[PDB]
Amino acid sequence: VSGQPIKSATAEALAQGNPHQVDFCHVPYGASHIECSFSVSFSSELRQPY
Amino acid sequence: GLAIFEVRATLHLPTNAMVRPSQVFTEKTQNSRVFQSTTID
Amino acid sequence: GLAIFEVRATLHLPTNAMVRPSQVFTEQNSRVFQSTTID
Amino acid sequence: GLAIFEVRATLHLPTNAMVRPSQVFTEQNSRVFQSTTIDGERSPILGAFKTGAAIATIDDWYPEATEPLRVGRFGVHREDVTCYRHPST
Amino acid sequence: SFLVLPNIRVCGATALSSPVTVGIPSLTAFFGFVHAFERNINRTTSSFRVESFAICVHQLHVEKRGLTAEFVETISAPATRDDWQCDVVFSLILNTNFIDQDTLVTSLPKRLARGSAKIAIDDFKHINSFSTLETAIESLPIEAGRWLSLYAQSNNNLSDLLAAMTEDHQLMASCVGYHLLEEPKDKPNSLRGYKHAIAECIIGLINSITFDPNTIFWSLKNYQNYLVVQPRSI
RNA sequence: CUGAUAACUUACAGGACGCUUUGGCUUCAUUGCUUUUCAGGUGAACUGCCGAGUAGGUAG
DNA sequence: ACCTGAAAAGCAATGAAGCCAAAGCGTCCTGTAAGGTGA
DNA sequence: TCACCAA
């Protein structure tokens, strides 16, 4: 918590490997490109208070 | 006098748009919008 | 003289209609129905 | 001489019908049924004295007997509150 | 030597064990049941003599039922009262001084504190005797009950009672014996031609053991001024 | 030999009427799974014959 | 013809969990039976 | 036989 090194974390125990998990999305190999699609609506709600 | 009507709608919204139902009277994250709901199938 | 009947009725209500059972006497819910247990 | 019996009835009622157990004699709820604990349920019972009064409806030996009466001194009727076999008779 | 009477199911007993407490019926009623079960068998075998009896209660169910008293002479019912009753399903393990099946069933006594007590016909298989307490208690079926052990804690008052009734919410007080008021004399009318004295009830607290064999077994103890059904372990 | 003995709590019944929970919103930066590995028990059931027969039959 | 399923080390830290208003009124809770002593 | 009596 202060900044001096912990004496339990030796050289061997800090080169030990650290396993985790992520989600991983990517483009398939033979693909061409990627679409992305949505829609916006512009309304006049600001004219008077709700 | 009896007069029963059966009403039915059809809404064409944009792509992937939002629909707003009625929401219940609620009596580390707290639900800020709870919808009213019924069991169909 | 004994004469037991077995009545059965069939109600065709409208779509998603309302049915009104009898409701309890109580001394905050403002309409509490009478009930039993079937299944 | 001992002569144990073990009796078991089987009642086919109408749909969803009433049953009439015996009910209590105390001094709010105006019809309080007698009960016993079978397993974890409350269950309406019929009394050990409500039962024995039904085995002993025998008396049709009175001077003007048209119906059997429960066996007892100056044999009483509780439909009409009278004493057939009154002691002045 | 430990004769086992299983599932003695009393239908309508009395809960008024004292004029003061209501609950499980008195322990001079469970004693008078056994000493009627002894005294019947002394018609054939004149030296039967139960020494002590182990009580295993399942399913009390105390309730205010009614009591329609009989018409008494102007011919109407007597005064109206209120009566508590209980429906005990207990089982009983004796301790004999030393017998067919059909000798036992016809010599069972038929009332435990005003209530009809019965064994079902299908339960007649379990009236067999044994020799060791550890097998006789593993012998009877419907295992889920508490043995009656007296709470021998110094007490003098009702607050002495109620304090022990909250540390154990399953502790039940009732009548344990009769405290006399004079010495027994010869009267012209007495119950069955004996000496008669006037008594008053004695209220004790009653434990429940999971299973000290002597403590569980009860017996009749005579004190020059009272008579109390104590366990053997007091 | 049981606060002992004996013990029918009964009868009748309408809880109802009305009711818009709504408004706003960025989860996200970083990453080496490696090292090594015999399934065997296949000497059993052979060698002719007819037929265009990669089909199908037959001898001992 | 049956028999066998290897060991050795690791599973990250940083920050936050919005509010604001209310909770309806009218009306009722049944009657019959069951006394021990004394003038 | 009847006038007595409470929470």
Task: Estimate to the nearest angstrom the gap between the alpha carbon of E219 and the chain centroid.
Answer: 11
- Using a threshold of 3 CB pairs under 8 A, tell whether chains B and A touch: yes
Distance from residue D40 (CA) to nucleotide F40 (C1'), in Å?
65
Task: Determine contact: C4 vs chain D, CB below 8 A.
Answer: yes
Please report the resolution in angstroms.
Answer: 3.2
Method: cryo-EM
D14 and chain C: CB distance < 8 Å anywhere?
A: yes
| Segment holding D36, helix H or strand E | strand D35-38
Amino acid at A30: G
Nearest-angstrom CA–CA distance, E23 and E15: 5
Alpha helices in chain E (DSSP H): 27-41, 101-106, 133-137, 158-167, 213-216
E141's tokens: 């079926």
Residue whose pair of structure tokens reads 């407490």 in the numeric block: E21
Structure tokens at E122: 């299908």
CB E114 within 8 A of CB E26: no
Question: How many whole angstroms separate alpha carbon E97 and alpha carbon E36?
Answer: 16
Tokens of E131: 């020799």
| CA separation for the pair E81, E72 (Å, rounded) | 15
Is the torsion defined by CA of D36, D42, D43, D45 positive or negative? positive
Q: How many CB atoms lie within 10 A of CB E17?
A: 26
State chain A's maximal CA–CA distance in angstroms: 67
Query: Strand pairing of D76-77 and D69-70?
Result: unpaired
- The encoded tokens of residue A43 equal 């309304």
First CA to last CA across chain E, in angstroms?
22
C29 and chain B: CB distance < 8 Å anywhere?
A: no
- Rounded to whole angstroms, the Cα distance separating E96 from B20 reads 83
Give the dihedral of Cα atoms E211, E215, E220, E224; nearest 10 deg.
-160
Closest CA of chain D from C7, distance in Å: 9
Listed in order, strand segments (DSSP E) in chain E are 4-10, 54-58, 62-65, 83-86, 89-93, 111-112, 115-118, 146-147, 172-180, 199-206, 218-223, 226-231
SS3 E109: coil
| Nearest of E211, E224, E214, E226 to residue E56 by alpha carbon | E211
The C-alpha atoms of residue E86 and residue E97 are separated, in whole angstroms, by 32
Neighbouring chains of C at 3+ CB pairs under 8 Å are B, D
For CA atoms A7, A12, A14, A18, give the dihedral sign.
negative
Of residues E84, E81, E68, E118, the one with CA closest to residue E14: E84
Helices (H), E57-182: 101-106, 133-137, 158-167
Distance between CA atoms of residues E108 and E38, nearest Å? 9
B4 CB neighbours in chain C (<8 A) are 14
Task: Return d(Cα E87, Cα E13) in angstroms, integer.
Answer: 6
Phi and psi of D50, rounded to 5°? -65, -30
Give the integer Cα–Cα distance in Å for D70 and E68.
14
Report helix, strand or coil for B14: coil
The residues with which C23 forms a beta bridge, in sequence order, are C33
Exposed/middle/buried for residue A34 (C-beta within 10 Å: 0-12, 13-18, 19+): exposed
How far does B3 lie from chain A, in Å, by closest CA? 36
Question: For strand F, which nucleotides have at least one atom less than 7 Å from a protein CB?
Answer: 1-25, 30-33
Closest nucleotide relative to residue E67's CA, C1' based: F7
Q: From CA E64, how far away is CA B11, in angstroms rounded?
A: 67
What is the Rg, in whole angstroms, of the alpha carbon atoms belonging to chain D?
18
Cα A21 → chain centroid: 12
CB E169 within 8 A of CB E208: no
Kind plus residue range of the DSSP H or E element containing D77: strand D76-77
C20 CB-side CA count, 13 A? 0
Answer yes or no: is E192 CB < 7 A from strand F.
yes
Cα distances from B34 to residues B18, B29, D54, in angstroms, run 15, 13, 63
Give nearest nucleotide to D26 (CA–C1'). F9
CA distance linking residue E178 with residue E226, whole number of Å: 6
For residues E104 and E96, what is the distance between their CA atoms, to the nearest angstrom? 14
Element of type H or E holding D55: helix D48-55
Taking the C-alpha atoms of residue D48 and residue D34, their distance in angstroms, rounded to an integer, is 11
Residue of B nearest to A37 (CA): B15
CA D39 to chain centre: 25
Q: Return residues with beta carbons within 7 A of strand G.
A: A 13, 16-20, 22; B 27-30, 32; C 27-28, 30; D 30; E 76-80
Helix (H) or strand (E) holding D54: helix D48-55
User: Which residue from E33, E55, E187, E212 is spatially nearest to E110, judged by alpha carbons?
Assistant: E33
- Cα gap E187→E41, rounded to integer Å: 31
The string of DSSP codes covering D38-49 is ETTEEEE---HH
Cα(E94)–Cα(E8) distance, integer angstroms: 13
Contact D68, D60 (CB under 8 A): yes
Query: Which has the closest alpha carbon to E93: E186, E42, E46, E30?
Result: E30
Distance CA E120, CA E142 (A): 14
D44-80 b/e with 16+ CB inside 10 Å = b? ebebbeeeeeeeeeebeeeeeeeeebbeeeebbeeee
- β-strand pairing of E54-58 with E62-65: unpaired
- In angstroms, the CA of A42 and the C1' of H4 are apart by 97
- Helix/strand/coil (H, E, C) string of chain A? CCCCCCCCCCCCCCCCCCCCCCCCCCCCCCCCCCCCCCCCCCCCHHHCCC
Distances (CA, A) of E80 to B12, D27, D51, D81: 80, 8, 22, 18
E40 φ/ψ angles, rounded to the nearest 5 degrees: -70, -45
- Strand F-proximal residues of E, range 51-90, CB below 7 A, are 66-70
- How big is the CA angle at E76 (ends E70 and E78), to the nearest 5 degrees? 55
Q: Which residues pair with E200 in a beta bridge?
A: E179
- Residue E231, SS3 per DSSP: strand
> Token pair of E73, please?
């002479």
Nearest to E65 by CA among D53, D54, D32, D43: D32
Give the H/E segment covering residue D76. Answer: strand D76-77
B14: its two tokens: 């944009």
Residue type, B18: M
